[PDB]
């Protein structure tokens, strides 16, 4: 298996771990803050997914410092993981185009 495909699969597994850990740590950080809505794990996981994908509907958002720091990690992990997937697709296309050119 080539590196870029192994790295993509590794990034996908790492992203799932960030989503699960991010959902657990957000609830742990948001409870205790009056008005916080990111205080139950099922919707916290939904919030983490729409954060890593950078969709950000606005139905859920962190208000505490550590809840927002968790959000930052989720954002970077999601942007990086999907970016590595795009990078792997580019390598696949470039490698196929080299063979298409004989070189």
């Amino acid at each position, epitope marked *: 298996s080539a590196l870029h495909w192994r790295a993509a699969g590794a990034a996908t597994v790492l992203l799932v771990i960030v989503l699960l850990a991010g959902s*657990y740590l957000a609830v742990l950080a948001e409870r205790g*803050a*009056p008005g916080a809505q990111l205080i139950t*794990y099922p919707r916290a996981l939904w919030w983490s997914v729409e954060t890593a994908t950078t969709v950000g509907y606005g139905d859920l958002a962190p208000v505490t410092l550590w809840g927002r720091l968790v959000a930052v990690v989720v954002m970077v992990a999601g942007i990086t993981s999907f970016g590595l997937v795009t990078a792997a697709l580019a390598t696949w296309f470039v490698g196929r185009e080299q063979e298409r050119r004989g070189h």
Partner: antibody, heavy 118, light 106 residues
């Protein structure tokens, strides 16, 4: 089997302190929160605080006077609420409840009738 | 914090008649309301979770409705075992808050 086990009663002198217990059994997950609810005779339910035993962080109701300290012991699966400087206004029934991190209190304890008297 | 008003405090119903309990929230909480039953000298018992979801072991006559700020706990054909206090509790915003409670008498 009963999931949350609390003592029957505790007699506390005015100003003295007491520590209540709540032995947990059944399924226990890392997403468990133990809550404490206060109910005076002739009153509704009053949320006191919460604690996650898999991490040890405790939150408290900021509307009321803070007279509690929530601890947890994972080796014996027992949460503790330490009440300090008790007056007659603190005499109530104190329940413990287990929340699976999804909002509601699925199971309650029998409650410990705390009577502050001389 | 979120305020949960239950009015009226006492509901008088003849046997075998439907009875509805009211729980109004100071602000919208979607469907994050939960109902409990407490008989005399008893511990609270979960009846309905998330406004309208059933609980295993709870009789079929118990149901719930509503979303937003107004929530209803309905008991089809009230019986003597249903004589207790009924509380609502919200889980949308921290901290969790309870309602004042509504007593059912027959």
């Amino acid at each position: 089997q009963v999931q949350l086990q609390q003592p029957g009663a505790e007699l506390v002198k005015p100003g003295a302190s007491v520590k209540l217990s709540c032995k947990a059994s059944g399924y226990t997950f890392t997403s468990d929160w133990i809550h404490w609810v206060k109910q005076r005779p002739g009153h509704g339910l009053e949320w006191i605080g919460e604690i996650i035993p898999s991490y040890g962080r405790a939150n408290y109701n900021e509307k009321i006077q803070k007279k509690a300290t929530l601890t947890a012991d994972k080796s014996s699966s027992t949460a503790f609420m330490q009440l300090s400087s008790l007056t007659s206004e603190d005499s109530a029934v104190y329940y413990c409840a287990r929340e699976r991190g999804d909002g509601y209190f699925a199971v309650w304890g029998a409650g410990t009738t705390v009577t502050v008297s001389s | 914090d979120i305020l949960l008003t239950q009015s009226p405090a006492i509901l008088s119903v003849s046997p075998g008649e439907r009875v509805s309990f009211s729980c109004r929230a100071s602000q919208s909480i979607g469907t994050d309301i939960h109902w409990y039953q407490q008989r005399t000298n008893g511990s609270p018992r979960l009846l309905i979770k998330y406004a309208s979801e059933s609980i295993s072991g709870i009789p079929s006559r118990f149901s719930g409705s509503g979303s937003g700020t107004d929530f209803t706990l309905s008991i089809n054909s009230v019986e003597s075992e249903d004589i207790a206090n009924y509380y609502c509790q919200q889980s949308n915003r921290w901290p969790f808050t309870f309602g004042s409670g509504t007593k059912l008498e027959i």
